[PDB]
Design an enzyme around this catalytic site. Structure first.
Site, PDB file in Angstrom:
ATOM      1  CG  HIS A 118      -2.046  -0.987   1.072  1.00 41.38           C
ATOM      2  ND1 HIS A 118      -2.046  -2.210   1.720  1.00 41.38           N
ATOM      3  CD2 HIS A 118      -3.153  -0.967   0.293  1.00 41.38           C
ATOM      4  CE1 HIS A 118      -3.125  -2.889   1.356  1.00 41.38           C
ATOM      5  NE2 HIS A 118      -3.809  -2.158   0.486  1.00 41.38           N
TER       6      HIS A 118
ATOM      7  CG  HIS B 266      -1.848   0.020  -4.325  1.00 39.35           C
ATOM      8  ND1 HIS B 266      -2.516  -0.934  -5.072  1.00 39.35           N
ATOM      9  CD2 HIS B 266      -2.765   0.563  -3.500  1.00 39.35           C
ATOM     10  CE1 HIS B 266      -3.795  -0.941  -4.718  1.00 39.35           C
ATOM     11  NE2 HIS B 266      -3.966  -0.060  -3.746  1.00 39.35           N
TER      12      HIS B 266
ATOM     13  CG  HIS C  94      -7.086   4.265  -3.509  1.00 41.31           C
ATOM     14  ND1 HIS C  94      -6.009   4.245  -4.368  1.00 41.31           N
ATOM     15  CD2 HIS C  94      -7.184   3.013  -2.994  1.00 41.31           C
ATOM     16  CE1 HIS C  94      -5.491   3.027  -4.393  1.00 41.31           C
ATOM     17  NE2 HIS C  94      -6.176   2.266  -3.556  1.00 41.31           N
TER      18      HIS C  94
ATOM     19  CG  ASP D 152      -8.090  -0.807  -4.274  1.00 42.29           C
ATOM     20  OD1 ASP D 152      -6.863  -0.636  -4.220  1.00 42.29           O
ATOM     21  OD2 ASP D 152      -8.822  -0.884  -3.264  1.00 42.29           O
TER      22      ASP D 152
ATOM     23  CG  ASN E  87      -2.595  -5.923  -7.799  1.00 41.20           C
ATOM     24  OD1 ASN E  87      -2.557  -4.849  -8.411  1.00 41.20           O
ATOM     25  ND2 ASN E  87      -2.339  -6.013  -6.528  1.00 41.20           N
TER      26      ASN E  87
HETATM   27  C1  LIG Z   1     -10.701 -10.971   3.809  1.00 41.75           C
HETATM   28  C2  LIG Z   1     -10.024 -11.299   2.511  1.00 41.75           C
HETATM   29  C3  LIG Z   1     -10.031 -12.756   2.153  1.00 41.75           C
HETATM   30  C4  LIG Z   1      -9.443 -10.379   1.750  1.00 41.75           C
HETATM   31  C5  LIG Z   1      -9.658  -8.890   1.778  1.00 41.75           C
HETATM   32  C6  LIG Z   1      -8.491  -8.036   1.307  1.00 41.75           C
HETATM   33  C7  LIG Z   1      -8.171  -6.863   1.986  1.00 41.75           C
HETATM   34  O1  LIG Z   1      -8.906  -6.481   3.073  1.00 41.75           O
HETATM   35  C8  LIG Z   1      -7.111  -6.066   1.583  1.00 41.75           C
HETATM   36  C9  LIG Z   1      -6.349  -6.429   0.488  1.00 41.75           C
HETATM   37  C10 LIG Z   1      -6.642  -7.576  -0.252  1.00 41.75           C
HETATM   38  C11 LIG Z   1      -5.757  -7.921  -1.400  1.00 41.75           C
HETATM   39  C12 LIG Z   1      -5.342  -6.944  -2.222  1.00 41.75           C
HETATM   40  O2  LIG Z   1      -4.502  -7.083  -3.270  1.00 41.75           O
HETATM   41  C13 LIG Z   1      -3.960  -8.320  -3.510  1.00 41.75           C
HETATM   42  C14 LIG Z   1      -3.086  -8.400  -4.579  1.00 41.75           C
HETATM   43  C15 LIG Z   1      -2.500  -9.630  -4.848  1.00 41.75           C
HETATM   44  O3  LIG Z   1      -1.626  -9.724  -5.877  1.00 41.75           O
HETATM   45  C16 LIG Z   1      -2.810 -10.766  -4.081  1.00 41.75           C
HETATM   46  C17 LIG Z   1      -3.698 -10.660  -3.030  1.00 41.75           C
HETATM   47  O4  LIG Z   1      -3.998 -11.744  -2.278  1.00 41.75           O
HETATM   48  C18 LIG Z   1      -4.299  -9.414  -2.712  1.00 41.75           C
HETATM   49  C19 LIG Z   1      -5.224  -9.268  -1.596  1.00 41.75           C
HETATM   50  O5  LIG Z   1      -5.539 -10.230  -0.868  1.00 41.75           O
HETATM   51  C20 LIG Z   1      -7.684  -8.397   0.195  1.00 41.75           C
HETATM   52  O6  LIG Z   1      -7.976  -9.535  -0.502  1.00 41.75           O
HETATM   53 MG   LIG Z   2      -7.473   1.039   0.533  1.00 40.80          MG
HETATM   54 ZN   LIG Z   3      -5.794   0.306  -2.635  1.00 42.95          ZN
END
Ligand SMILES: CC(C)=CCc1c(O)ccc(-c2coc3cc(O)cc(O)c3c2=O)c1O
Ligand SMILES: [Mg+2]
Ligand SMILES: [Zn+2]
Ligand SMILES: CC(C)=CCc1c(O)ccc(-c2coc3cc(O)cc(O)c3c2=O)c1O
Ligand SMILES: [Mg+2]
Ligand SMILES: [Zn+2]
EC number: 3.1.4.53
Lengths: 323, 316
Positions: free
Chosen positions: A73, A77, A113, A231, A234
């Site tokens: 973050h 990003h 953000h 957001d 990825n």
């Molecule tokens: C409760 C739950 C299962 C997930 C909720 C949750 C968040 O609160 C916050 C960030 C992510 C996330 C974001 O960007 C990614 C990028 C990648 O390349 C691989 C990844 O795994 C992720 C992620 O996980 C997320 O998923």
């Molecule tokens: Mg955020």
């Molecule tokens: Zn973000």
């Protein structure tokens, strides 16, 4: 090196921009150079009478308020979400749908953000009785903070990039930016997706084939989901980018889990480095979060996002094949 | 003087407590003495094992963070909303756990703390630091909550120190849900939901947390808007105070070249017509619904509201 940077920035309209290379080539200023490039591409300095020195001063200050010691973050990003939102805004199904002010709001919201993100989740901040969670009454703690910082930095010396908007434009932009950034709170994902599904099921198109959005609620809902898709984009990127993002978020998640474990707290999902399956976690992330969202976005703008969805599905199949 | 204050507090269970006399007799500590009485009346110090010195320390600190130079949104209003909620909780027709009662009373006590005497819209339209912090959304009410909770961290102020970890989490959530509901921009949505509940009311009965917190939200909102249902001598004092506060805000809006908020223009005001409009459009629709919910426990309160509306109309 500036020549190489300029060449890479020619890809700003493309999904799969070499954003890590641009971060290196720019001296860790990807958000500044990508925002500046996008503002020139969309003629936003001319349209909103933004002085270029003011834009650069604000962007550099904003980028400074992302944490360089947070693995995911951070300003890279932010630049990625900006550039992804910029591509999503150019999709044929949305041509001439949004005003210049709404376009400005969506790109600005993307840039701010996650500003000043500490690298831990809302739930961590709530459960540790953090000053942030105390300030914000446990409600969209991070996202309220990102907004407050992003707007407050406009008051710094030669930083008000909105100085030449009318009062009504500033008022409208501020409301839209708030509505957009608050929707990036991951605890709102299921409700945002449910509403997006409703819109797809009932959608209307003009004679010109573009999405018909005739009230603020529908327009802002599309912009909210657009930035949320950006957001969560990825896993829809070429695998070498996706894997770098995954390495980064796992580092950030594992550091949170180490703090949770040390405090005798339950460790958050995907944060336990001693009981982790990164591959299984990615398949589940895509299956339960990312693909439901992107399949619905792809339906809204069909067929514009088919190649993005194809990449997401290929990346899921690749990760599944490692299990 | 300290003997007259004790006799005034004997009516702590009555609608129409002499809260201004109590404010005077306690040396401007109505919030501290009334909260203490109510906690002692409810053996809350024993039920939740609260040290008496810790309660008093917090209460004085909390009372100190109400502004003495704000004519309405000060510690007397806070004490009055606390006491009004206390009475509404004792409605025979009401069913809330002791933690829910505690959250309703604590929420009432903190619900306006550090109020600057201007509205959310004023803070938003003037680009205030508060509105910048809170993204224009329930700006005051988020602030009241953050201050009320932060004060628990001062020395000898943690009145919840002996609640279980789960109790503290639950109480915190309920207090936030209640104080956020006192934002006047949410009045119509709150009232709409109170009406839906009245149409589906079951009595011997609120089975789900959603319904119960909604009743508590509406109860504290009723208590916040209870001045026109009090005896007329009290209602008139509250009206004099909020008109002073409104007129000082309207002076600032005029000087800034802003639109003057309703009731805030001292050069084009009709306090009496404003009171009839306030009752007809806000207070009586709310209280008629509450009275239907708790039938017939609120009849004397609604009677007083209707008498006071009739009187204000006669002053026009
Ligand atoms: C409760 C739950 C299962 C997930 C909720 C949750 C968040 O609160 C916050 C960030 C992510 C996330 C974001 O960007 C990614 C990028 C990648 O390349 C691989 C990844 O795994 C992720 C992620 O996980 C997320 O998923
Ligand atoms: Mg955020
Ligand atoms: Zn973000
Ligand atoms: C119209 C609306 C939905 C909200 C406007 C609004 C506020 O935002 C905030 C406070 C009040 C209010 C409160 O306590 C009173 C007490 C009195 O004794 C006399 C009074 O007039 C009032 C009031 O007006 C109000 O009415
Ligand atoms: Mg209030
Ligand atoms: Zn109040």
């Amino acid at each position: 090196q500036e020549d190489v940077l300029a060449k890479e920035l020619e890809d700003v309209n493309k999904w799969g921009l070499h954003v890590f290379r641009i971060a290196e080539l720019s001296g860790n200023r990807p958000l500044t150079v990508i925002m500046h490039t996008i503002f020139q591409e969309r003629d936003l300095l001319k349209t909103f009478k933004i002085p270029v020195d003011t834009l650069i001063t604000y962007l550099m200050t904003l980028e400074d308020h992302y944490h360089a010691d947070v693995a995911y973050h951070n300003n890279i990003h932010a630049a990625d979400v900006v550039q992804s939102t910029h591509v999503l805004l150019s999709t044929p199904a949305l041509e001439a749908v949004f005003t210049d002010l709404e376009i400005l709001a969506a790109i600005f919201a993307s840039a701010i953000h996650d500003v000043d993100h500490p690298g831990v989740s809302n739930q961590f901040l709530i459960n540790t009785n953090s000053e942030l969670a105390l300030m914000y009454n446990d409600s969209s703690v991070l996202e309220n903070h990102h907004l407050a910082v992003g707007f407050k930095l406009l008051q710094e010396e030669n930083c008000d990039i909105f100085q030449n908007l009318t009062k009504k434009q500033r008022q409208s932009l501020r409301k839209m930016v708030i509505d957009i950034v608050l929707a990036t709170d991951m605890s709102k994902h299921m409700n945002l997706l449910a509403d997006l599904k409703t819109m797809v099921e009932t959608k209307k198109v003009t004679s010109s084939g573009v999405l018909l959005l005739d009230n603020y609620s529908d327009r802002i809902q599309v912009l909210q989901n657009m930035v949320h898709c950006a957001d969560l984009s990825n896993p829809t990127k070429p695998l070498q980018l996706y894997r770098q993002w995954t390495d980064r978020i796992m580092e950030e998640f594992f550091r949170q889990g180490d703090r949770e474990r040390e405090r005798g707290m339950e460790i958050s999902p995907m944060c336990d480095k001693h009981n982790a399956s990164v591959e299984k976690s990615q398949v589940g992330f895509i299956d339960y979060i990312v693909h439901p969202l992107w399949e619905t976005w792809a339906d809204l703008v069909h067929p514009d996002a088919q190649d993005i969805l194809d990449t997401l599905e290929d990346n899921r199949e690749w990760y599944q094949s490692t299990i």
